[PDB]
């Protein structure tokens, strides 16, 4: 009952700039609430009663909230403000939580260094053999990571992982993998991988053919 929804799912924004996201309901709703998770650890008491701020909230914030569609608005942006946010709803008989907006800093478009590492000694004494692309510290988020065994654009078998907003490096990194046996890898050759970034829509890649 009463489903709530976040405006931009994700959102990149540089410091300074003003920004605003939105909740938008299935109903007329009294107060409205917002919480702010920062990945891994449970959300904090953030915005309540439509515009009342929990102490320790910086004032950069402002709760707009119109009967049925409500905004959340940041004036100037800081680093701290980097996080992810939701909207509560006291006033349905079963209380519901919003979509989840995610924030991140606009950074100077950076390309990614792409390291690839053929299967280790041991793995071969174990058959089911595997190969890693290691694409590091790059921005923005857009990334058509793809592999290509013998130029064949391999769909399945892939395992992606991705850290976010390197607290220090302020950018991402994403170790994808790939697997078979000894067999059907002896199989194809040209065991290579390519990603595609926002900057360098002229595609960059690290390849492999050994033997």
């Amino acid at each position: 009952q009463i489903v709530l929804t976040q405006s931009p799912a994700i959102m990149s924004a540089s410091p300074g700039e003003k920004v605003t996201m939105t909740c938008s309901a299935s109903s007329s709703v009294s107060y409205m609430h917002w919480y702010q998770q920062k990945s891994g650890t449970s959300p904090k008491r953030w915005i309540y009663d439509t515009s009342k701020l929990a102490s320790g909230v910086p004032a950069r914030f402002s709760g707009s909230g119109s009967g049925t569609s409500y905004s959340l608005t940041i004036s100037s942006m800081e680093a701290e403000d980097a996080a992810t946010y939701y909207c509560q709803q006291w006033s349905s008989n079963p209380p519901t939580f919003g979509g989840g907006t995610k924030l991140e800093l606009k950074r100077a478009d950076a390309a990614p260094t792409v390291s690839i590492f053929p299967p280790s000694s041991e793995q071969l004494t174990s058959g089911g053999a595997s190969v890693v692309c290691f694409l590091n510290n790059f921005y923005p988020k857009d990334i058509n990571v793809k592999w290509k065994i013998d130029g064949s654009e391999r769909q399945n078998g892939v395992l992606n992982s991705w850290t976010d907003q390197d607290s220090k490096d302020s950018t991402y990194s994403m170790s994808s993998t790939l697997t078979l046996t000894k067999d059907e890898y002896e199989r194809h050759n040209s065991y290579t991988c390519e990603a595609t970034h926002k900057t360098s829509t002229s595609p960059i890649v690290k390849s492999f053919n050994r033997n």
Partner: protein, 215 residues
């Protein structure tokens, strides 16, 4: 005082489980307590609530069966619990209080899977001899074939400062797997001691496993 709930929790599917939530020897039987589902990368699901004076429960429809709530007026604790669960029930749950307010608990992770305590398959990572043309070449420890989180990595121990990007576990086939990477100058590793202290507090292995090229 801010809420408390225990370590981490793990399950065999189609089974039950008792999850705690302790509070102060006062403020206790007065405060409306809820529970919330979050499944890594999930939004938020309100399960029922329960009152400590009365002990009145109120499950959210789409859980009424699976879940049940209760309390112990004495122990200043409120045990919600759940039975017969899926690799999909597998999530993190927290209780909380507060009028307009909130002040949550540190949450609790729960894992619905089928194997048990696997020590990991620990392979290292060296390039096709400067096949990655850079003045500083990249390096990695792969930690495949495991199931009891969490796994910890340190490179030549906690010797290594930066460019030490470590990845999150990608569970699959009921088996956790994750891959870390370091980067260093074509001055460094070529001819220097670089172990990686891969480790496990389940199996208790310090599989401290060194790295050089040549395959």
């Amino acid at each position: 005082v801010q809420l408390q709930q225990p370590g981490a929790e793990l399950v065999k599917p189609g089974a039950s489980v008792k999850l705690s939530c302790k509070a102060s020897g006062y403020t206790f039987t007065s405060y409306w307590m809820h529970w919330v589902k979050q499944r890594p990368g999930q939004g938020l699901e309100w399960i029922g609530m329960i009152h400590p004076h009365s002990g009145s429960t109120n499950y959210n429809e789409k859980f009424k069966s699976k879940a049940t709530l209760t309390v112990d007026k004495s122990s200043s604790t409120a045990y919600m619990q759940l039975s017969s669960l899926t690799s999909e029930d597998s999530a993190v749950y927290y209780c909380a209080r507060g009028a307009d307010v909130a002040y949550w608990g540190q949450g609790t992770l729960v894992t619905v899977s089928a194997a048990k305590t696997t020590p990991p398959s620990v392979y290292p990572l060296a390039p096709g001899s400067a096949a990655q043309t850079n003045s500083m070449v990249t390096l990695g420890c792969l930690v495949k074939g495991y199931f009891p989180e969490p796994v910890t990595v340190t490179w030549n121990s906690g010797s290594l400062s930066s460019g030490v990007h470590t990845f999150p576990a990608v569970l699959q086939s009921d088996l956790y797997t994750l891959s870390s990477s370091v980067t260093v100058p074509s001055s460094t590793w070529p001819s220097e001691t670089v172990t990686c202290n891969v480790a496990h507090p389940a199996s208790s292995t310090k599989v401290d496993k060194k790295i050089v090229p040549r395959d």
